[PDB]
Structure 1
């Protein structure tokens, strides 16, 4: 036979002693929600294919939750996982971490705005930023936090004046022209 390419199931544990093959919880929750919502197979199998992706403390929770209610849906199992493992960030601490992110790692301007944007996305899920200015606070924090050249600095400020508040892909296209 011709060779097989394959992807591992992403495994989650909740353990503080996390292995290199174990993901952070949000990555696993995307896989688990795909199994719950998008796979064609019955919920009596979807319970099992979620459990196969768990080991250690997080697998114990799958047992605890089914012991409390054998009739539970997979979606409601994931609500229990969200309840337990969903992050402890406050509005204050998400805002501080978003504002005190500052190109320290020698990043390109494009790489810095990628890292920053992960925290901005988080802050917008917490509603810690108004969605109607999420683009403005991106420009603000990039212009505060990045070692800009003037030719890009004035181009961002022109877009800020004109009203085309960049989406992340628009801000990237604008950064592409000056960074290349």
Structure 2
């Protein structure tokens, strides 16, 4: 009778060769846990709604897990998905992948510091960085890993010596004022 504003399902596949519309697993698990815990629908239909987001190797895991136990809960299915596809990292590995992450040739500095902030949140959740030094390891990892130079280097080096170090949104406010 009238147009209804629809919404796209977050598809996941588990391949390394992931297609452009397929999400990283952590984003899919947030959708699948909403279907598991929060939706009103019966559990036989929860399985259907989980599986209709899966394609390729991740769908093959759903078939395997159901075939071993047809009575399995959607919660225990997501425990199997966590146990297979969930991120494996640890103190040494998270610290290394964060510090080893340089700016790529196509990245603007504001995009690089946004990417880098995701890695810092990952490392803080693994308790590999104390939150009270997160600002230091931002400014220092930006200066070490970026291809930045000149008056931008000077403004960051000033802030590194300033005392009150930037929060991420303030650091971005500065870096955008240099992107212009």
Q: Deviations over 1:28-80 (max 9, x none)?
A: 22221232233333444322211111133322322343455555443332222
Q: 1:60 to 1:108 in 2, by over 3 A?
A: closer
Higher mean C-alpha deviation, range 123-132 or range 149-158? 149-158
1:108 positional shift:
1.9
Partner of 1:15: 15
SS of equivalent residue, structure 2 residue 7:
strand
Higher mean C-alpha deviation, range 146-155 or range 20-29? 146-155
Q: Deviations over 1:95-134 (max 9, x none)?
A: 2221122223142221221222232222223222222322
SS of equivalent residue, structure 1 residue 21:
coil
1:156 positional shift:
4.3
Q: Deviations over 1:132-161 (max 9, x none)?
A: 322221122112223445655555456555
Q: 1:142 to 1:86 in 2, by over 3 A?
A: same
1:11 positional shift:
2.0
SS of equivalent residue, structure 2 residue 121:
helix
Q: 1:49 to 1:115 in 2, by over 3 A?
A: same
Distance, in Å, in 1 between the alignment partners of 2:6 and 2:69 is 35
Partner of 2:72: 72
Higher mean C-alpha deviation, range 16-25 or range 45-54? 16-25
RMSD: 3.0
Q: 1:73 to 1:160 in 2, by over 3 A?
A: farther
Structure 1 unaligned blocks of 5 or more: none
Q: 1:167 to 1:30 in 2, by over 3 A?
A: farther
Higher mean C-alpha deviation, range 149-158 or range 125-134? 149-158
- When normalised by structure 1's length, the TM-score is 0.77
SS of equivalent residue, structure 1 residue 55:
coil
